[PDB]
């Protein structure tokens, strides 16, 4: 596949859609899903949410140029806003110059809470579980046997407490479980219900929450880019002054929140719009993000921005990315699936390293637009 | 208007849209908006981003029961996942019954940032700044004097400096500017960029950056919601107990930040929906929301949860919520004007404050499911 697409943005709709098409070899059906409005029937629409009255639309582009690992792909985005798709699309033509992107990503693993209230001896009854890890990890294994099957479950456990509550000491306990090509809240939460009356057995607390955590640190995806100065000249700047300037904006991300929060709503801006154009969940992801972004007590960048020893200019993002290829709208929208079919991935953590890399391209886009920008006199 | 519409969640698509049609008296041709796909036509989508070669339709939902400061509402919710848009519903059925959801709104005041940089005395060029401020601000305010007629404007400076980065000295100023009816982002970066030749000519310095913060802390939306032990029952749980297992989920988000990152996504569950529905930029809005849960150096809950000395259940939502009626594609979706149209809202900030109302209903109704689930 060659992802270049020359004159993409200066197309009609109908032709960009035609040399698609052509690339991928999309069948006549997957096309004519983009003949008309109206390609996610109201049936399947009024059985995703309650109290449906209709649909509502969003453009579906594709960005141009991506290539992860060697590869060439198409990425499919659904968003509202101007200068996205051309920024990540013109920021990949820069990365493919120098080998594209290059990501890697953990196993896809979820942590599912359970939440034990009213111990007497909390830091007691934690070594009380993990004298007990295997009994544990074995009952949340029990049932779902196509996870099983597939090379997923139950990892292990990991026990928090939190002595400082107004509300008495919590125990935390954590299952490490790897959820395959799911997001994983359906998944973990049915497990976290199964565990709770053993573990209640064992601490002799209540069980009170019983659910995922959408801080999906164990299951972080990782892109790298690099461009060169002579990629970055302006007609005002060197492209080694303009790598001076990014790495002056990056600096102010990483000590101002009041710009972090701005920064990485641009890796967002690239981000939110494949998740939604592949019918995941955007929320989960944002919430991941962003908790992330503050883990060190600090609300910092998500991205990196270096110069390397040969003075080009290289970033990086990692980050939390639970997404899935299965689950709800991902396969009962016939465009999530189309946006499937035009990514080309084969597992959902291929699918998180597409998405690192989107959110990089996008947050340089932005970075090198405002550092360029001449002022005014 | 009645927003409790009974029996709508069983209703076909067909009949509850020609319900709300009835109730708020849409013409023929805004239920038409609905009742046919294909409401954004290619030449807007086309013209909306860059390399389109089609549309991607989300559902379009209505959450009923909603009451703001004694007035019913509809609220229009965009969305792919289950559960959201009936427990809003749920939730704002059994608020009604304690006066529905109260909330207040700051102004619209958001921030542009001006960094300056390649000067040795940032500390001392902040002063400078602030001694000249009526001057910046007048200059801000000649680049939108339809704003001011509006009754907006730049109101304020504050300078903020950095003395020892890594990449040396920064100073970085801040626009505080009331934006009336719009998100603020296009309002406040043409203001920047005004300002800045005069700020170098002031400190010295080189500009750089000149950009609105999405951290749109001077922008707050505040709802308020109680609930009582009666309403909380089940077969299973007195109300007193789930109350106070609804507060022990409160602690635990307010200390774990894996706990509160789940948590604050079942807020955003309530308000990117609407934000959606009404063309606005929910990253904007998420950026806005989680940096302000770590304002404090610990990621915590943006709502609170207490018992009052009734024992009732009392729950706020306190946050940033940078909307507009204006700007951006809330004027270009047919949908997001008859989103508007069905609202009845009138100022951007009379939306922030049921997307905070929204918000504070969706964690209510998850904490209430965790709660009492045996
Ligand atoms: C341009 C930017 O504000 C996103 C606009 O949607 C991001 C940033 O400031 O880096
Ligand atoms: C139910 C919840 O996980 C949202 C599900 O999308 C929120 C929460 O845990 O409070
Ligand atoms: O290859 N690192 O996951």
Redo the contacts between chains.
């Keep these: 596949l060659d992802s270049r697409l020359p004159a993409?943005?200066n197309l009609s709709?109908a032709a960009?859609?035609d040399h698609?098409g052509q690339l991928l070899g999309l069948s006549h059906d997957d096309v004519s899903?983009?003949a008309?409005?109206?390609?996610?029937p109201?049936d399947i629409?009024?059985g995703?949410?309650?109290?449906?009255?209709?649909?509502?639309?969003?453009?579906?582009?594709?960005?141009?140029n991506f290539q992860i690992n060697g590869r060439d792909v198409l990425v499919p985005?659904?968003?509202?806003?101007?200068?996205?798709?051309?920024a990540a699309?013109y920021m990949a033509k820069l990365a493919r110059a120098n080998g594209g992107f290059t990501t890697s990503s953990s196993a896809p693993l979820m942590?599912a809470?359970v939440?034990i209230?009213g111990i007497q001896d909390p830091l007691n009854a934690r070594l009380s579980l993990l004298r007990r890890k295997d009994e544990i990890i074995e009952l949340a294994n029990r049932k779902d046997q196509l996870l099983n099957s597939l090379g997923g479950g139950c990892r292990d456990i990991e026990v928090?407490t939190?002595a400082?509550?107004?509300?008495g000491p919590?125990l935390?306990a954590?299952l490490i479980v790897d959820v395959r090509d799911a997001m994983g809240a359906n998944t973990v939460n049915t497990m976290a219900?199964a565990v709770a009356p053993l573990m209640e057995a064992i601490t002799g607390g209540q069980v009170?929450?019983?659910?995922?955590?959408?801080?999906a640190d164990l299951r972080l995806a990782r892109a790298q880019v690099r461009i060169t100065p002579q990629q970055l000249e302006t007609a005002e700047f060197s492209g080694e002054a303009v790598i001076e300037?990014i790495?002056?904006?990056y600096?102010?991300a990483?000590?101002?929140?009041?710009?972090?929060?701005?920064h990485?709503?641009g890796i967002?801006?690239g981000i939110?719009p494949l998740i939604?154009?592949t019918?995941?969940?955007?929320?989960?992801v944002?919430?991941?993000?962003?908790?992330y972004?503050?883990?060190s007590?600090?609300?910092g960048s998500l991205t990196t921005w270096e110069k390397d020893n040969n003075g080009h200019l290289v970033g990086t993002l990692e980050m939390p990315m639970p997404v899935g290829l299965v689950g709800?709208?991902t396969k009962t929208?016939p465009?999530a699936q189309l946006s499937l079919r035009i990514l080309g991935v084969k597992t959902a953590q291929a699918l998180a390293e597409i998405a690192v890399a989107v959110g990089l391209a996008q947050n340089l886009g932005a970075m090198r637009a405002?550092?360029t920008?001449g002022?005014?006199?």
């Excluded at 400082?164 to 509300?167: L, V």
């Excluded at 019918?279 to 989960?284: F, H």
């Design positions: 993409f943005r709709p960009r859609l698609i899903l983009l008309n409005a109206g390609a996610l109201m629409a009024n995703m949410i309650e109290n449906v009255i209709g649909t509502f639309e969003l453009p579906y582009a594709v960005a141009s985005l659904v968003v509202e806003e101007p200068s996205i798709v051309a699309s942590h809470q939440q209230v928090h939190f400082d509550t107004p509300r919590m935390v954590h219900e009170r929450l019983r659910i995922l955590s959408n801080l300037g790495l002056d904006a600096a102010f990483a000590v101002d929140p009041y710009r972090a929060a701005t990485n709503k967002m801006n939110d939604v154009a019918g995941n969940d955007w929320r989960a944002e919430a991941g993000a962003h908790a972004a503050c883990r007590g600090h609300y709800g709208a929208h465009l405002l550092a920008e002022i005014q006199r």
